[PDB]
Amino acid sequence: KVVKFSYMWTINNFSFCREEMGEVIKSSTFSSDKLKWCLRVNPKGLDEESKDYLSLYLLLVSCPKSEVRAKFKFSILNAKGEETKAMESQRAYRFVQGKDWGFKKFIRRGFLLDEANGLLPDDKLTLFCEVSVV
């Protein structure tokens, strides 16, 4: 009926990422199996328009059905584990196996990489994703 679940992704040594525009890092897969999901981030954006941003997407990796509908929310955890800078889908999106949905302009690199803003404690970026399938 309703299935809600989450995944915390810690990306270590974030400041050292050498990904150029268009290059991707994928997380490990996770589930609530049947369905398998992963997160995917472009540290230097998906394209020229988003070069100044991290792009963050949810990918349906494996799926027994033709399609699944899911709402999602991504946030960044601070040193206290508190969610900050969240973006949420305003409705459910249609995933098929191999389809992603997310935010091309999730967070400004010039904000995230300034350590005084407190989102890279010990140079780790911690993302938190919550997914609901109805």
Binding site: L46, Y53, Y57, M87, S89, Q90, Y93, K99, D100, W101, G102, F103, K104, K105, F106
Partner: peptide, 8 residues
Amino acid sequence: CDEVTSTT
């Protein structure tokens, strides 16, 4: 910045 899109 808050628009949902897909890479495909």
